[PDB]
Design a protein around this ligand. Structure first.
Ligand code: CU
Ligand code: CU
Lengths: 620, 620
């Protein structure tokens, strides 16, 4: 009965039926996106009306549509025709992936380019890459995908070890036409294989690792009810899943005394982009929006016990729609478990003679997705002390290219003749705040150094300052590690026993943001990535920092346009959008399969509680 | 019979005997420091002469001495008379802590100050704080300690909850006289107790935490030989212990196939300082060097199984000297264990159909120390992929004061009338580098943004630049989180299969450095804390970033003096000194006992290996 329950197979089938009945889902139609709509602010209808939103693609080219339906009433609430040439193309369909290689396989220009390289077409894999928006006039109003080739010597061969540089093709996946085939010259195809499961490369397997047994005799400390409602060590929340954003956390709250205190209404990674910094014409257009263009949730992996999730794990198997509206379950796509997290608090007192030690723990909610060569792990952590944290784990195989003989300033060499273009992995966390309720405000906190003089004769004093962001136009902030800059989200109407507004402090990793030139296509399409922190007034239709349609869409929507409304955010229903990412200069150690690298952020209570909230943790 | 073996109780007793028979250990003498000397560069001399370094304090005031003895030959190698007024005072003795409170208890000025506040002198605890160096001319030449009072209502009461503000005294612990008692006014002593084990504060203990069993049925994957030589998953190292620095890692090396490749010769936290930023004259002089002035190693805690260290733990029990030269063992003062560390590498390939997942592990070597109200955990981690990491965990009870009526810009309120002065916890990691040998160099790597134009028409390109630090005069570097600055330690004479110098990249947390005014005493005495990274040419006598006798030294000793030599560091035996710390604006949540906060750094292989070094890890 929870209005925050996961989408069921039945609801998805019902959406399919409603669309069919409305004459909106004929045989030429495809569901590019389907997701449940969150309830509007303030308990509207007496009961909860379950609604879903869908992006309908048309394989014949007719205009696509955005439709919202009520599975409860079996009706179409609204259907609008989409002008893709203006608002953007629909997310890429998995069924379009193979279309690129297949079409090029019969194109004389492509075959000629391969022959010139002595490559057998039957062994050439082509990666279906999003196209973005550049200077190609013919692409206006065309659903395009670009292809980069990789040689696969045999069925189980890792094609990434064999990039075919100097070649790229543009394909219209709807009209089934190869618009362009660019060949800037023949580069040697890196010879070494990158098969990390081949003993020839792994050598004899280590026999030195002893087993580590992690078990919970009496079961986990958390409970799961209503299918996705979690309660663990004072925490309370609902675990949602969206085909686009993946795991989404709802109603994060903390039990303080006799009341459930809200902290975050909705938390998610609203976008993740991978911009490449190689100026070569073959890849200078490369910018992969995993979330917005491909929909990361769609590719969530089924997690194996013992391998992906170790210990006493509780799985959730979310359901998504396939391209035809049929429900598809992602078996064990979300795993949840608690784990020991070292020392929480400790003190040995020289005067009282009392020695005290308490261990910490954290609740883990995660999923792992795979998009082509990359694999990303998304982890949300809840700690005993009230800290909330997110961590992204990037691994998989690096996207490759040829390494020029004369060397490069935008590519690193991973093996003889094998290159790895520089790139970034930039995420955007959308945090719909609710610190003790919806009346919130954000304060930028900087360390303040003081000059030696009257009032500070020894020159030891240092302080800090807090600046309230009152309007959206002044809520676009940059990190400043040098001054220990953080952002506090507080509730001006809710004070702790010391008469201070309760709050939570956001700690960023302060990694470099988007490096692209500000006048580049990517700087516009990924504007959110140019600044560390954005604050907007909550609005039902402001969901992603890049807008609803990112594929082949120019700038104009997303965060920059939202902030333009310059709404009041001083003690209002606000949303924090935090940009964070990794700048990757591939190492030889990253080849042939890369070890995990991490990035993220966390929010710690700041005067939210009246004292430590973990004084009731048992000794043993 | 390793030259890096832990000191035995016998060796300490032997040092004591040598000193006594030499007439250097009379009744008035005290061992202020005692530690074994590392082998000098070049072990080409069979049988290493075991030598110990000793700082001998004279409670009579007669000049103290620095003595080097050979326990192998039973002789005094050298004994130098120390002029403390010039080179600094000796480290504070634990037995001196007590003298401050006892001396003040008989001083009329102190008693009057307490009487006015209606405090029973028998209930007043006095924290023995180091002095420092300021405008007090009568202190030069005198061994001083300052005292700050706290009320302890009963034997098991936490005195930190009851600071006595507006009062501070200075005492000459040698002549045993109170030189000054400053009373700036009466402040209410905070009323609430901070007894975190008292049910009235903890409330009913949670009964919701289910047990987590962590075991290793076949034992740990690491071996310990020669008492302290560790070998784990290709790693090799020696775990040493010094009363001043605590746990020290020696000869960190990694088995790359046929050869044992060195990485770091010696790693340690050579200093840790806690500067306070409250301009009040009661505390504006407060700066305590846990390592240099108090010797954090001597206060290492005995770690209890199941509380401090969980899982299959292997303990080391280092032995230190007491103030009289008697050996004292710190039972289970060092914990060593391995632990699962999530996903190491993962990839599901769409073309090969191969799914691959491998788990990561880390070797943990740690200890926990207690200095008055603070407790610090020191952790060194070795990862499967070759990464080396250090992490400091700060907890304990915050140093308190009164919270002024009218508020404060340098103190936070944690309870009614109770304040917590702003301060920092700044560490210095001394890394004697040995990347594939001693011929090393350091390069500062910055991200480089590129402007849109010829050669970068789309404005997507970005690069990086490396600057070799060739002389010490140019090796005092600052962090720059915005340009993703890191430092690479490479060996220009050792190349990987791609003909590139092998190296390791240092990743800093980019936290704020010393905030105090550049003209302050603390900015001079802890100059190392003003910059993130220093590189010096290796030298036997350059051990600490603050010099050998930190206590009451005028400043400039250590790093500033070493760097002044302006030696060649481009492809030489070098040492990296990394400054990193936490800036603490205490939160209500930190009271009455604070949750652990962390800070650290790590080093990852950068073209050190010819490809991923963890391809030989099994599935398990
Ligand atoms: Cu990457
Ligand atoms: Cu602190």
């Amino acid at each position: 009965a929870s209005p925050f329950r996961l989408a069921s197979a039945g609801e998805i089938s019902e959406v399919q039926g409603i669309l069919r009945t409305a004459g909106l889902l004929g045989p030429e139609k495809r569901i590019a996106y389907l997701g449940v709509l969150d309830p509007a602010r303030g308990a509207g209808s007496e009961a909860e009306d379950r609604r879903f939103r869908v992006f309908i693609h048309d394989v014949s080219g007719a205009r696509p549509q955005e439709v919202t339906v009520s599975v409860t009433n079996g009706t179409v609430i609204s259907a609008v025709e989409l002008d893709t040439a203006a608002t953007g193309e629909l997310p890429v369909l998995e069924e379009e992936f193979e279309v690129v290689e297949q079409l090029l396989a019969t194109d004389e220009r492509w075959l000629k380019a391969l022959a010139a390289r002595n490559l057998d077409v039957s062994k050439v894999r082509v990666a279906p890459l999003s196209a973005g928006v550049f200077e190609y006039a013919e692409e206006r109003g065309r659903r395009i995908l670009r292809g980069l080739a990789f040689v696969q010597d045999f069925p189980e061969d890792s094609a990434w070890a064999h990039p075919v540089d100097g070649l790229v093709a543009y394909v219209d996946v709807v009209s089934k036409e190869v618009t362009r085939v660019i060949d800037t010259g023949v580069f040697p195809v890196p010879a070494e294989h990158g098969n990390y499961t081949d003993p020839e490369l792994t050598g004899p397997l280590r026999t030195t690792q002893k087993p580590i047994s992690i078990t919970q005799p009496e079961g986990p400390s958390f409970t799961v009810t209503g299918g996705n409602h979690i309660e663990w060590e004072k925490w309370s929340l609902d675990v949602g899943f969206d085909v686009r954003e993946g795991v989404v956390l709802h109603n994060i709250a903390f039990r303080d005394g006799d009341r459930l205190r809200p902290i975050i209404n909705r938390a998610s990674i609203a976008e993740m982009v991978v911009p490449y910094g190689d100026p070569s014409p073959i890849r200078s257009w490369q910018n992969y929006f995993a979330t917005g263009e491909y929909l990361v949730g769609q590719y969530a992996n089924s997690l194996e016990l013992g391998c992906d999730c170790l210990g006493d794990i509780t799985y959730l198997s979310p359901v998504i729609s396939d391209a035809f509206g049929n429900p598809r379950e992602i078996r064990n796509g979300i795993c949840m478990h608690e784990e020991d997290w070292g020392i929480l608090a400790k003190h040995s007192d020289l005067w009282s003679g009392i020695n005290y030690t308490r261990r910490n723990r954290r609740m883990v909610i995660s999923f792992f997705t795979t998009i082509g060569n990359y694999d990303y792990g998304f982890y949300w952590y809840l700690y005993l002390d009230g800290t909330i944290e997110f961590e992204a784990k990037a691994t998989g195989v690096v996207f490759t290219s040829a390494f020029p003989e004369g060397g490069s300033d935008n590519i690193s060499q991973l093996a003889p003749g094998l290159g790895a273009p520089f790139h970034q992995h930039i995420f955007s966390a959308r945090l719909d705040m609710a610190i003790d309720g919806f009346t919130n405000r954000v304060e930028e906190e900087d360390v303040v150094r003081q000059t030696m003089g009257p009032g500070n004769e020894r020159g030891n004093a240092f302080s800090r300052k807090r600046t309230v962001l009152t309007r959206e136009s002044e809520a676009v902030r940059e990190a400043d590690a040098r001054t220990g800059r953080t952002w506090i989200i507080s509730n001006p109407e809710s004070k702790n026993r010391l008469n201070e507004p309760v709050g939570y402090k956001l700690h960023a990793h302060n990694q470099p943001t988007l490096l692209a030139d500000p006048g580049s296509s990517i700087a516009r399409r990924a504007a959110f990535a140019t600044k560390d922190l954005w604050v907007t007034r909550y609005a039902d239709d402001e969901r992603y920092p890049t807008g609803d349609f990112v594929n082949q869409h120019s700038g104009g929507a997303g965060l920059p346009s939202y902030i333009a409304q310059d709404r009041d955010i001083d003690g209002q229903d606000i949303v924090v959008w935090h940009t964070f990412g990794l700048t990757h200069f591939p190492r030889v150690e990253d080849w042939p399969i890369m070890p995990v690298d991490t990035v993220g952020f966390k929010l710690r209570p700041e005067g939210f509680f009246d004292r430590s909230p973990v004084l009731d943790v048992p000794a043993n």
